[PDB]
Design a protein around this nucleic acid. Sequence first.
RNA 1: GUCCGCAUGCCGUAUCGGGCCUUGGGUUCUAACCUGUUGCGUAGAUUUAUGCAGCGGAC
RNA 2: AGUGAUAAACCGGACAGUAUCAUGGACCGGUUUUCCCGGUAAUCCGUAUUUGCAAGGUUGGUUUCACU
DNA 3: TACCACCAAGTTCTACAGATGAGCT
DNA 4: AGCTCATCTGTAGGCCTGATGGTGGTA
DNA 5: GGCCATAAGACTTGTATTATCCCTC
DNA 6: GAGGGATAATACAAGATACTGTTATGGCC
Lengths: 305, 317, 306, 318
Amino acid sequence: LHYIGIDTAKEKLDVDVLRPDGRHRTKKFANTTKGHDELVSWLKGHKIDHAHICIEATGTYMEPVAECLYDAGYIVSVINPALGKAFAQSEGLRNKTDTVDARMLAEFCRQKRPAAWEAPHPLERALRALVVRHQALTDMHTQELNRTETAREVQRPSIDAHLLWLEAELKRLEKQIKDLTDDDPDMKHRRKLLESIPGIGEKTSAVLLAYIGLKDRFAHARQFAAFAGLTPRRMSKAGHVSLRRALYMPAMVATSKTEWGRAFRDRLAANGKKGKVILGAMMRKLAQVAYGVLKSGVPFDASRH
Amino acid sequence: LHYIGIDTAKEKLDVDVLRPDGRHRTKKFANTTKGHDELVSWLKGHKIDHAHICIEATGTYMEPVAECLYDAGYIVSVINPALGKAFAQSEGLRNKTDTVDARMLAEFCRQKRPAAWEAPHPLERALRALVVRHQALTDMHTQELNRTETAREVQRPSIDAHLLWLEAELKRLEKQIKDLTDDDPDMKHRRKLLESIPGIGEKTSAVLLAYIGLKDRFAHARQFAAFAGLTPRRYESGSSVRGASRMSKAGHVSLRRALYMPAMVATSKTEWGRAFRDRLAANGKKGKVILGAMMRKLAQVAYGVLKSGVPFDASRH
Amino acid sequence: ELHYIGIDTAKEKLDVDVLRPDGRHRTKKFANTTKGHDELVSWLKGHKIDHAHICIEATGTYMEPVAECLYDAGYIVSVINPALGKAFAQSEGLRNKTDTVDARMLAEFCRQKRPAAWEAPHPLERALRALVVRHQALTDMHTQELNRTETAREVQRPSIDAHLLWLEAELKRLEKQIKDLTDDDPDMKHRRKLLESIPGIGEKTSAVLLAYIGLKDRFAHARQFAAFAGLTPRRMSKAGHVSLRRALYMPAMVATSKTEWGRAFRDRLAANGKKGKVILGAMMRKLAQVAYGVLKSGVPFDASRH
Amino acid sequence: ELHYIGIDTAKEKLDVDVLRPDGRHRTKKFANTTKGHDELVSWLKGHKIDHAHICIEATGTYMEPVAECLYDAGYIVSVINPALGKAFAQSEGLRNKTDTVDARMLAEFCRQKRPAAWEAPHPLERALRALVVRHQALTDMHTQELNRTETAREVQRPSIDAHLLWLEAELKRLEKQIKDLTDDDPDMKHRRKLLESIPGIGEKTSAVLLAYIGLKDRFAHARQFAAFAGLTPRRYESGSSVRGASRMSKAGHVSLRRALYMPAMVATSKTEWGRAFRDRLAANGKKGKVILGAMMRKLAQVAYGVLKSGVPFDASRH
RNA sequence: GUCCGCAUGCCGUAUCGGGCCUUGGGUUCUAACCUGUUGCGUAGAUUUAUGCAGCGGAC
RNA sequence: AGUGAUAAACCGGACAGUAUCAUGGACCGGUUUUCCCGGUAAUCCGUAUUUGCAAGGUUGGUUUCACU
DNA sequence: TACCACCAAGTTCTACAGATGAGCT
DNA sequence: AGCTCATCTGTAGGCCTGATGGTGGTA
DNA sequence: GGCCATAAGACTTGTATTATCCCTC
DNA sequence: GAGGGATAATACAAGATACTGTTATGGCC
Ligand SMILES: [Mg+2]
Ligand SMILES: [Mg+2]
């Protein structure tokens, strides 16, 4: 079993093979379909058939090669780059370069033996991509709303025209998201379950489903709450900002306008917890209950809370 | 002569009068047209005819009251908010940081006797509004451009639709700016003079007019370069203390923002600019250091050319 | 007819800037020497300047000779805390820092702010303060060597031991010199005795307090003297003499631990859930105020008041 | 067969964590005393732990006795730079309960990394380092009193003048004790003479260099010794877009880095080989302090080089 | 009701540090070349939030 | 101490943003320093968006209940 | 009258200065 | 033997840890 | 069945801008 | 003569003040 580190750039890949005997092989390739084919050929040239490959999440530039190698039948791991940075310090490395990084990742692979990565399902990719786009538009819409607050009259026609366009485009995406989940029987069913939770509506169900996926890739609900960056350490914030930010207003609605939410808010209020601290707790609770309800396969039952 | 400080917020004004005899008169008002009329009456009530008011430049919320008082005939100074903060720290060693009161502003006014403020011409206000709008849409356009690189396929129709919209809008504002400056014969002439400078074109000339204005409100070109935050900040004391010089950046960000690309065009594609680049390069200056020097130079020549009243003459450089 | 004069100060040179009533400036550079200071007084009288208010930053001890020269010549002198000058420059919108700029800045500071006049301290106060801060220096070095004995190698031990003996003898010598100083003055002797009547304050703290409180009633309120030490909150400000603040912590511990009035104070704050060091912080402020209070009263400490 | 043991040390107590081949742990606390150390070894031999690799953090003199005990008991001991410990913990997860490093973490560090084995220094190497370190302390104190002379009040000056004399005599005394140490050992006498043959290295810098290099050559390459001093440039590069400036890493002993600054200033100013090096670098647009940095690295590297060569400084090689 | 008095309550995390650890990257390949800004020392200045409470005195 | 179970309890301060303000050090001719008067589109002192904008990654600590 | 231990525990600013080794007087 | 003089914006990381002064208590 | 008010108060890689010149149709 | 592409720069830190929106639900007509 070989261990292979790949350092990724926009244009090139730097590869470092760590042989069982402990010697290294190194080569650069273009970060292209042609380059990826050269890489697989080169590995099978040196009779490397069984290998565990470690690569860092580097924008989207690592994705095609990771899929390529997975299909070629290698174990691929895509690591959070924070882990790689800490690892480099733990090895007492005194430089940061492409070849240094590729070698660091081969050692990471051997010592840590990280979990294997799976390529997401085409629909999972699509839904995530629509949810991320929708959030980008929403942010732009908010920028333009803030501007109306202090805008001069000559500026105001421009801002208004833009707000109309952005409102129409947001509505179009929402329908494109709905069509996606309605067409897949699994997603249609899983979305209907998420919405049964009081405090979770159309917008938040699509976000939750985008990050949970089609399958139950988490063993326990609390792992998904950790995934979102919501568990205390202060909150870790070791997780997707986009998932975490999407739960804040659902938390307020829950703690304010639902039976199970108010019950939770009061119990923590009694123990002398401040406004946001409760919302923090409710965010973590919504994440956990959302995953729980999907495992159960059954509508939200308030009796459990 | 009285000394009045006004502490401004969205909804409420807080006023503090400082009498010649050294006593204070304080009152709060609404930040509305009604509130501003109450204020003038309340001053005129206490026979305060001559005064020097000092207001922080907090944003658009303090502009209506400043214009109200300027019209009522008082002397109004609108001060950079960072001066107020620094003034407080000069008044004691343990003063409440992050607090500048109306009382503190009345003192500021008395001690410093700041320069008077003049409400801008309606045409200057218009042009500045359009230019600032133009810059905002450019930034959104660059946001969406950056996204096309790494976008997923489902996302691309959306990003493409938005880019076409933003281009059409940018083209429209450009025309609106052009129609503004062409319908005023002074601005039409002044803009033509700016664009005669090699490295200054349609977009930079508008930004420059927006901040120079119709009148010549700077006595010297070196003051306009200071205004943009482009001058080097020297730091020396005695024999021991010798800080390195750097662009001060104490000045208007929108001006400074607009001059970097012109500077890069001037030092690259132009005689008088390459002349300047080569000299400083010989004397050991790095590439982006030279750019910062060209930024200050363009500012200063822009003001020089307008004051001269004739097109850019290369012989002077 | 009052002129306003700024002086920027360096080790070797002085930059002087004179702001006239009519509003025009006169400037000149001088050597920072006895001869230079004489040239300065001549240059002013040359320009027919008798009434001036002079403003100079506290710049180590380099500003002190010229401050004394000008005060003796009969001018008004203000020695300003330079943190105020830096804020002033920023309030004045200045974009460069040079010696000629700073001298001009200080002349305006003078005109606008009209700071309180500076009085040169009494020779006895100057000496006492000098001995106290020396004593503190050597105590710092003694603690360093003493900390080293813990982890020291055996070849290092003879050296560290020999130094500890030297520093102990020197500290004793200085303490005696301080005692001889305060004894030879009737007022200081009396005031020293009053301060030591406070439970928690002994030979060492009393000399530090005398060295900053003055010979006379210098402060108008107790909390002013507590602010002077950097003890009033704004978190504790720490904007004040570190040598005075340093001196009050161990008194504060012994008082809150082993005195009636101090334990009383400790318990009151402990009732309201205050941490160990937070109580000590509070006790430091209190001691500073009571030290000032007792001296003003002119009579020994009375616990009944607290 | 091989066990992996972490030891979390404090002044008073040890906290031990054995990690067995099967993957289960043993834990027991001991007193940090001669008794405790003897008790620890017996407890290990009780559980028939004869082959092990112990891993301890380098926290000072409080952990040295136990490390020596175990080394003599026949185990493999590693004394790790504690910064490695903290970084390893962060590499093990994204949301760890605490940032602290404990005995269990050290056992896992040891298993995954199999760090290099620690060796107790020679008694003379230990003595020489101790004397050199003491000398540096006395210099700093002397420098403090020199600075005070400048702005002292008159009533203070007797005190400062008397201290300055005491410290000057003590520094002179300690220099002789260092000279006697190196002269008495034929190996150290020789090595020290070699170092002083280098232009720009004299009596003070030679003793500091010996103190860290020691009696034997424990670096495979001279460049590793410059790294040890923290004198090597730190490259920061990634892809097309990420390019930092190379700056002295400073990841090594301050004492060496401190010691070499003036030798570098002397070498580049007065010696031939140093001026040669200054000139070429200065021909490129290298600033004055940048060249000093470079010369500090070179001096470190040639110091190690010359000792490895075993023959005086040959100028023909430069 | 106002003005004064205060060794008053509310508010408060001192000072100086000390010791030990550190086995680059690239190259024309290890005392060569490209890549390099050490260490962190000294002195001086610092006058209330009387802000709000108490308690006391005078008018 | 491992192993499972967990939509329960304890620990929990999300994100994104918006608008606005800024009158050098000095140099060159007079005076014979500066100031002041006159001049500054020149020379020396400059690392833009007070370092802008985009994308990607993130599988709790414990408490209970079992089982050994 | 002299000696002991134990209480508490993880800001600004304005100016200055040494070091070491090789060559020169 | 003693003196001179060579560089100027600022920016590694970690883990162990303690005295001080004054008082009441003790010898 | 449609509309409105209300609840809280750091890692790994990338990138454009404008104005002038130069080129093709 | 009009329209479009390529291009110049690279370690980062170093002023302030005033402010706003997100979603999902239980209320309303
Ligand atoms: Mg990488
Ligand atoms: Mg000064």
